[PDB]
Design a protein around this ligand. Structure first.
Ligand SMILES: NC(=O)C[C@H](NC(=O)c1c[nH]c(/C=C/C(=O)N2CCCCC2)c1-c1ccc(Cl)cc1F)c1ccc(F)c(Cl)c1
Length: 301
């Protein structure tokens, strides 16, 4: 069971505007983005605010801390710039911005690059210089996914963009995965062997279809750090990205574990580095509430 541990809202706000979250390198502290563009650090057990930083002029949609704790990526809705990289050393400071990309991720093995997405286009940037190294787009192989997000594989050699597998070194598209849906572009399994594109699981060696998993339709997915569990939540067609439910799956065989309906719209979820806890941002009140008034709920896995 997910055992509820704590709940909290954004402090000194009439309406709570938490939108996204990620655990910090510090045990007990969660980073939360807000609908007015702030980044907050909270004690996840006591629900107390520790620090606040001004990041964007619009809602933070997504964020991602580097493992070493030194760097943070943020993305926003209708700001310019849409994404940015922040230093979390002495002074919280913007290192680089990514004017055109509405979503960004770090490289996975060595976190020296950022991959950004604009529509069906991937951009790869050097963290040090901020320089754009590669643009990845092939008009001949595009799938035109509506909710595309470009991503590196575990060893940083490959990129999946718009259902197309790219070799990063040669900057060549090596395979296009056929389109089976309008929206979801897919991710790499942390095992480095499989690609998960909506309901289709592809073998990365053969490009053969390994499994079909209907429950993953229209889902964003995230794995726990140890790569044993996969969380999925179905996108909706300051509105929540997701519905009221998320599902877990065994990462080794894609078998369903649990379906969790929180009966409230979900904005985000994340696990801690040790995969003990799950933090979920949920809107209070009722399904599809108009009022933006989110809480963070912490569960023990
Ligand atoms: N942090 C993570 O990576 C976890 C991940 N979060 C997001 O994917 C996410 C989390 N948030 C968003 C946007 C938020 C957004 O667009 N808005 C609209 C304006 C008001 C704020 C929310 C997204 C998101 C939506 C679409 C796209 Cl294609 C890209 C995305 F990143 C997740 C994985 C599995 C899950 F079960 C859950 Cl509940 C969450």
């Amino acid at each position: 069971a997910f055992r509820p541990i704590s709940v909290f809202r954004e402090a000194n706000e009439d309406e709570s505007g938490f939108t996204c979250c990620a655990f910090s390198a510090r045990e007990r502290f969660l980073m939360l983005g807000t609908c007015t563009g702030q980044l907050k650090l909270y004690n996840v057990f006591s629900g107390q605010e520790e620090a606040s930083y001004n990041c964007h002029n619009s809602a933070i949609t997504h964020l991602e801390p580097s493992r070493d704790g030194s760097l943070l990526l943020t993305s926003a809705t209708w700001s310019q710039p849409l994404s940015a990289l922040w230093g979390m050393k002495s002074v919280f400071d913007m290192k680089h911005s990514f004017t055109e990309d509405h979503y960004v991720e770090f490289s996975k093995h060595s976190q020296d690059r950022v991959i950004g997405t604009k529509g069906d286009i991937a951009h790869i940037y050097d963290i040090q210089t901020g320089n754009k190294l590669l643009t990845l787009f092939n008009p001949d192989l595009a799938n035109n996914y509506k909710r595309n997000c470009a991503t590196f594989n575990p060893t940083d050699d490959l990129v999946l963009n718009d259902g197309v597998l790219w070799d990063v070194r040669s900057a060549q598209a090596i395979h296009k995965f056929d389109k089976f849906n309008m929206n979801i572009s897919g991710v790499f399994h942390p095992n480095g062997l499989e690609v998960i594109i909506n309901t289709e699981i592809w073998d990365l060696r053969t490009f053969h279809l390994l499994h079909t998993v209907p429950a993953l339709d229209q889902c964003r997915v995230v794995f726990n750090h140890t790569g044993t569990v996969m969380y999925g939540a179905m996108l909706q067609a300051m509105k929540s990205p997701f519905g009221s439910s998320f599902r877990t799956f065994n990462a080794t065989d894609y078998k369903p574990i649990a379906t969790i309906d929180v009966k409230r719209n979900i904005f985000d979820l994340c696990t801690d580095t040790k995969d003990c806890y799950l933090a979920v941002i949920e809107n209070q009140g009722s399904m599809d509430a108009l009022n933006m008034d989110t809480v963070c709920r912490l569960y023990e896995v």
